[model samples]
Structures are given as C-alpha cells and as structure tokens.
Target: TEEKKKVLTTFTVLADMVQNVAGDKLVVESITRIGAEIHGYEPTPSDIVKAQDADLILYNGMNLERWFEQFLGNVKDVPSVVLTEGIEPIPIADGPYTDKPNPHAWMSPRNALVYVENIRQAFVELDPDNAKYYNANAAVYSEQLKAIDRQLGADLEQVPANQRFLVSCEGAFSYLARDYGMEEIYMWPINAEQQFTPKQVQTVIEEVKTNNVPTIFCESTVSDKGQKQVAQATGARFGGNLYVDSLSTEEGPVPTFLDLLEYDARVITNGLLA
Candidate 1:
C-alpha cells in the first residue's frame, strides 16, 4: 500500500478550504494554529521540519504570509503552489504595504471558487492517479460556494444602500465588500502593524458619524478595543466579531469556512438592519 500525499497549508482557513476539495485524498495540516496571528507568523524549527516532510505546500500567495519567503528557503525541495494565482487583487491603498495585493482574496466566495479550482489543479498535478476524485470534489465544493455567494448577495439587501458600510478593525473585508456592494472602513489596512493610532480612531469615528453607520465590527483574531472606542465615540452599536485570518475551534461559532461566511454575513446584516 502507498502512503497518502502529505500537504501543508499556511493557516487554518486554507487548510479547511483545501480539505473540502482534497477530501480523503490528501493529508492536510496548517502551519499556524487556530487564533494565531497569521500575517507575521514566526515559523519555528518544528514548523520547518513539518514543511520539510510535506510532499507539497499550498499557501495563500498574495503576500499573506510575511515570513513565507525565508521559511521557503529552508524547505527548498518541497513543491509548493500559490492558491491565489489568477484572481485580480485589490491593492492596499494607504499603508506600509500599500500598492501591494490585499492578501485576503479568499474572503469573497467568488474568489473562493478560484481557490477551489487552483487547489484541484495542484492536487491533480501532485497525484494524477486521483485526478478524478479531485475533480469531482472540486465541482461539488464550487457549486456550494456559488450558492453562498448568491445567498449573501440577497441577504445583504436588508441593509439599505446608505447603510451598506462595513466598518471593522482591519481592512480585511475589501474583497467581501466589493463582492457584496458594501463599503469597507477600518482602523488599519492590515494586521501587520496592529497599531490603532488616535488619528485612525478619530478618522473612523468621523466617517461613521458622517455616514451614519449604525454599527462597527472587529475581527476575532485581534482586540476589539479600537472598534469599541469607535462605537462609543460615534454612538454606533458594536457589532459582533468577524472571522478572518483563521477559523474558530470545533466548539466556536465558525469552525469551517462556510460557517465563517454565513456567520459574518448574518452578524453584519442584523447589526446594520437593527
């Protein structure tokens, strides 16, 4: 009997996405644990050893993993694939990493279909013998993604166009906002800095006040202090957390990618509509 191909993903979100398409065909693991800060991940020696043993590595390639390049050099022999190869990226408009890709392409269900196809292709190339299995799994998952995309589009309509603002701690919702016709406002461009300056807080407060945004939010992976302050200052309600960068544990609200999407959409809709 032959051993199954071992695949390594950079984060839990990618691991869940890949498992949907790979099914039982591949043994997948995430380098970063649940709730870990993924952007500035420090790969330990143990993580390097895990990469060295992996048959293939699939990472979200829009510069999401800041330490990936140095980490890749230590595991040169392992074949790797960038999951966001073909999607049109939204560049960070104002930040240290400005003019670069947003790196959160998977936030949108439309972009997730692209990720599914990329994962299927990588699996096919890695193990052509199981191409049929990968293809079938990819097709089923792709349809599910499309269905969620349609569902979100319709559900988001509950919020009037003027109230279609998604204010959060991090600007990770650029892709999601673009897909659903909502506007995204955040204290920071990405989590790499994690600093919430007075100016940033004031800016968001003023924006919320000027636009009459009813609620504000923050990602689960980061502290909600800044968003909470915005809520207090602007008199807007503090909407619940949004999941990105990583998924929750089995007992948490968003244990899976689909759950993350649905939970977030529901939270945003209920908050804004209320």
Candidate 2:
C-alpha cells in the first residue's frame, strides 16, 4: 500500500527466491537474464543503473559473478548482501583450481537452506518493519525445502546405486554429487576457464565407456556440446538438462531457486533410473 522497495538481483534464481518473501511489495529485477551464466558475467551499463537505484542488491557471492565486482564496487551506495553468507563453501575437487573449492554451493539442497537463511536475514535488515512477515515466509518456505530434500533423497535411492554417477561438462555439482551419493565425472573442474582440454575429454570418455553410465547431463547456463561430444565419442546417452551453474527463466519449470533444486534432482533421477 505504501512505497514499494526497489530491489536488484544479480541473477534470476536469487530474484525468484527474494520474490517468495517480498512478493509484490518489492520490485525485483535480475541483472542477468534466464539461462545466463554468472561465472564471468560482464554487467552492462543498464545493470549498473539498476544497482544504483535499488534499495538492496542480492547476489550469490561465493566467487560467482567475478566480472561484476568492479561494477558492484562502483555502486558502493547500494546495500548488497550475499545469499551465500553463512554457507560452508565446498572446495573444488578435480579441475584447474583444485586448491579452491567450487563456489556453486547452491547445488546441494542443504546448502540452499543456508542461502534461504541468509536471504531472510537480509530481508529483515532491509525492511525491519516487515521482519515478522519475512521470518514467517522463510519458515514456511523452509518446510517446503525440507520436503524437497526428503523427496530428493528418496528419488536418488530409486536409481540403482551403481548408476548414481552424475557426469557433466562442468563440475558445478560437486556438493550435489557428494550429498546424494553420486559419482561425478567432469570435463572441467570449474566454469570460469577455457574449453575442455583433449586430456579432459579423453578422461571423461574413458569413465563413461568403462562405467556404461548412459546419462550424462548438460547444465542450463553453459553449453553442453562438449558433454554431447563426450557422449557421442563414448556412446553414452546424453540424458537431460541439469540446472547447476544457473537456474531457468521465469517461465520455465525451475524458475525459483527451490524449484530449480527440485527440478534438477528430478531430471537427474529420471535419467539415472531410466
């Protein structure tokens, strides 16, 4: 009924999550659109203007959006909060930057709850008058997340234990692989780098061939042609799309962060079980 709070989201998934709490009371727009990868996102001038006019800027900051730091720093007047605030980051395990863990912590459902808590705190701080409303929304959404976690576990179990490997082009789901008891094979350890090397492709091909793991996945944000190449070279069936590096569009099935997790898990499970 009063003045609407102007909000800016670095990505669509975070915007979707914030909309769950703020609903129509906040004007939320994502700097990056649907299926847009965030690893090295270069923000345009319009994005900087959005950040400048916003009451708050929401981001998934665990080395995500590395290219946007300069833009964010330039807009120091805006109050911004990282949704990955309290989540324990998983270290990168296999790729180029083995010393550092993967920053896509939101892949795991458990880690996503950490993001929810972080966002709830941000909402409470930004709109103190709506603290009660935000807390209540978080509590309800938390229950839904819990249910999704339970469902994900059950679905993972349905897939044969031997078939629980998630091979993809980018290693963005290290946490997801760990949480759901799945083996992971990746062409690249991280998404911030160049194309997959011949060595990387050959290694992934060997695993796919040896294990007969028919269902390799490609993520929404990045190109999966490399994965398809691996699949073609190895005779593994490229199963379905996975939402790891980024979430889908507002019109898609996995628009919200919660929906993204649930939809991704379902996609993986269906492929593995099939």
Candidate 3:
C-alpha cells in the first residue's frame, strides 16, 4: 500500500509475464527495452545502476541472456530470480549450439506456467504482505495462458498432421512444436550464433521443399530477409513475424506476452492451413 516493490525482468516479454502475475501490487520493468536484442545483449553502465536499484531482478535462465552472468555479477547485491528454474529444457538438437538448454522457455504456455509460478513465488518472497494478491493474479494469469495453449492445440488440430510444419528463422519453437506436434525446422540454433549462409539458405530451402511446407516464418527480433529468400527460393510464403524474444511497443500487435502467445499460435495455424 506504500511504496511498491520494484521488479525488473530481462526483456519485454518476460516483463509482461511478470507484470500479469505481479498485477497492481508490484512495479515491473525490463532492463532490455522493447524490441531490443535479448540474446547477446550488451548491458549499459546505466543498466547496472538500474539493476542495483531494483527490489528484485527476474531473468529467464538457460543462457537466454548471453550477458547475464556479467551483468548479474555487476550488481551482485541485488536479489534476483531465475524464472525458468523449474522448467525441463529442450536441448538444442544439433550444431555448435547443440546440447545446451534452449533458452526460450517462455515460448511454450506450459513453460510459461512455470515461469509465472517462479515470479509469483519471488514476489511473495519479496513482499509477503502482498502474497494473497499475487496468488489471485497468478491463478487468473495461468488460466489465460492455458486457454491459449488449449485453443492453439484445437486450432492446429484442424490442419492436416502432414501439413503441421513450423519453420522459423531461429530454433525458438522446440517447446511449442513439442507441445503442438509440429515438426520444427529453423535456419540457426539461435540468434547469438546465427549463421545465415547461402549454403544453409539452400539447405533450409531444400528442407521446405522436401516437406512440402506451404508457409514459413521468422521471429520479430531478427531480420526476415533470409527467411524470405528461402521462401522465394522454395516458392513458400513468409507467413509473418512471430514474437518470441520480445514484446513490441503498445501500438504493435504483440504488446503483451498474452498477445504474443495468441498471435503466434494464430499466425502458425493460419499460415499452415494457408
């Protein structure tokens, strides 16, 4: 009721998720601004100052933040929570980035439920006076995410099983793919080590052709040019931008995490059925 506890998350999408559970009880902000690069993001000196000022810092673990260790070390006194703590990660299937946990855990609603729990727990720990408030917020928030998860499954069920192909610019959809039963394909493991080579372009091109995929997509945080080139080369359409890494400005379609989830599911479903 007095000064609200300040909670800072790593990126925009994470901030939205945290904000939903924190509700009106806590103040939530992101270190990385909206649409800024998440992987390999460079934290400024100002960012370190802001981190030190926070009541609690929340970040997605599993190496999603390439500069996480360095940045956290800078503000070691500030308490932080790794929201993906309880998640069982899907390992990078192949390439130099292989074997490591795929860092985009929030992409899946199932994993997002885990993320919200961690946030709610951290909020309660930070300010137990607000525990009952956060509990209500988290329950309502969890149901919304689950509805998206369930609705997406039902939407995808309408498409033929053979037509369920999710090709993207980054390997950010393993969890979503696993949850919805779509065969995932991507040009690179993640953005940090993105290798947009002509060879890989043709390789993904051939992969699209082989699978007879009608539409392909890319993340909002990265350039879709390469994906478009692949689409052009293979006669497949660039479905649209899927918001995985960050949320957009209030004016953008995916200004909130819930909007991002529902937007992506619809985009994929509509794209596949197109």
Candidate 4:
C-alpha cells in the first residue's frame, strides 16, 4: 500500500495540534520525544534523515525553537510553516531573550485558536483533496479550544483575585497570564542555565514568602528541583509538574493538546483554591 504524506512538527505539543487538524489524513509526528526539554535542543543527524521524508514541517516560530531553525537548516527541501502566524506575541522582558517574542503563545487557549487555523490552512495547502476533512476537523477542534478558554477563565476566577499567581521555573506563561489576569513570576526567562543561580532561586523564595503563595510548579521538561527548593524554603507546597513545551506519553496525563491545557488549568486553580 502506498503511504500517505508525512508531516513533522518541532515538538510534541505542536504535533498534538497538527494531529487534531490532520486526523488520519496524514502521518504526523514530533521530532522531539515526549517529555523533551525543547528550548536548548541540539538535533541529531538521524533527525534530519527522518525529516527528509516529510511533506511539510510545522513549528512554533516566535523564537520558541531557535533549535528548530538549525534543525530546518538541515531540512532545506521540505516545506515548513510557522504555527504562531496570526497571534500577537508577548515579549520576553529579561535575559538574552529580552524584548524578543516570548514564543510560548500556545499556553493561552485563545492563542490555540490561531494555531488551529494556521494548521488547518497549512494542511489544506498541502493536501487539497482532503480539504473538507481538514476543514471539518479544524472547526471541531477550534470549538474545543474555545470551550477550554471559557472553562479556564471560570476556573481561574475561583481563586481569590489577590491570591491568583502562577510561579514557575521559566517565565513561560506570559500569554496565559495576560489572557487570564494571573500574576506570573519565574526563576528565569528561558532555561539556558545549567544551574539556577542563588539570586534566581532567592527571588522566587522571597516572592512566595511575601505573598504567602500556597503552591508553585515547574514544567515537565525541566528540573523541578529549583521550584521544589523554593517551595521548601518558603513553605509553599510544590504543586506539581505542568505541561508546557511538550506532551506526555499517550498513556500519561497530558497526551493531547486539550489535556495539556485542562491539566495545567486544573493544577493552577486547585493549588490556589485549596
């Protein structure tokens, strides 16, 4: 049997979004593995060989994956599209990424809507014969993202306005924070350091202590050690791992994009409301 055209995404989370649009129409895969730390990735030679078979490649391009750019350099012949095409990116305000686009736009389900539309159009242009199928799937998926957005807003409101905070290892939730009015603080802007400096950990420790913030979290891709240290020092409970840059295994909690959003939303509200 002849194989369908293949699509490669830069990471697991983006692959989940693409799968929602492509459905069974194409073979969609993530070049990065589940639980992958995406920010400072170095692609392997075999990764390029795998992508050579792809009909199209999709990535979050608000400088989310500077690694993906080098990966794409090795994949010149393949057509590629940036998923964050229509969204207004929140800028990174500190460190080397300062004033550049934050790139974690997918954290906001409102922005997820644009990613779906971009994926739908990308698929449509890649496979016109399956246009109606992609159109229908995208429409349905877009509604799910919208529903999640509404649910997130309602769930977040359960937390007292003064206590609404989302502190993590990296300042990855800027878009989500802006959309929902939650105050966000983090140890670093991006996960570039091998060790979180004392000043970095101490800053979060002071914030948690001053605010009496109940719980804090770290993303699945990076070490929770620093946030855990913050929690222990400040007496704030460590909420748990939140999904951001990648998805979990298929049998794991956040195997899909919707699950990732819902999981993080629940974790946040539950921590604050408890």
Score every model by TM-score: 0.98, 0.93, 0.96, 0.96
**What number of clashing residue pairs does each candidate have, in the order they appear?**
0, 3, 0, 0
Clash pairs detected, candidate 4: none
Q: Rate the local accuracy (lDDT) of all candidates.
A: 0.91, 0.79, 0.87, 0.87
Off by over 4 Å in 3: none
Model 1, span 1-274: residue lDDT tens: 6989999999999999999989898999999999988998899899999999999999998889999989998886889999999999999978688888899889999999999999999999999999999999999999999998999898898898888999988899999999889989989988666476889889999999889988789998887888898887789999788999999999979999989899889899988876
Tens digits of per-residue lDDT for model 3, 1-274: 3898888888999989988998888989988997777998889888988898998999998989989889888775779779999799999977776799999889889888999999889988899998999999999999998998888788778778888888998899889888889888898877655456777677799889999898899888887888999987788888888889998787978989888888888878888775
Angstrom error at residue 189, model 1: 1.0
| Two-way TM-score contest, 1 vs 2, winner | 1
Distance (Å) between predicted and true CA of 211, model 4?
0.6
How good is model 2 by TM-score? Answer: 0.93
Candidate 4 global TM-score: 0.96
What local lDDT does model 2 show for residue 171? 82
lDDT for model 4, on a 0 to 1 scale? 0.87
- Candidate 4 on 110-205: residue-level lDDT in tens? 899999999999998899989999999999999999998998898888898899999988888888888889999898887664567889889989
lDDT of 2 by residue, 96-171 (tens): 5676757778777788788888888888788888788878888887788888888888878888888888888788
Global CA lDDT computed for model 3 = 0.87
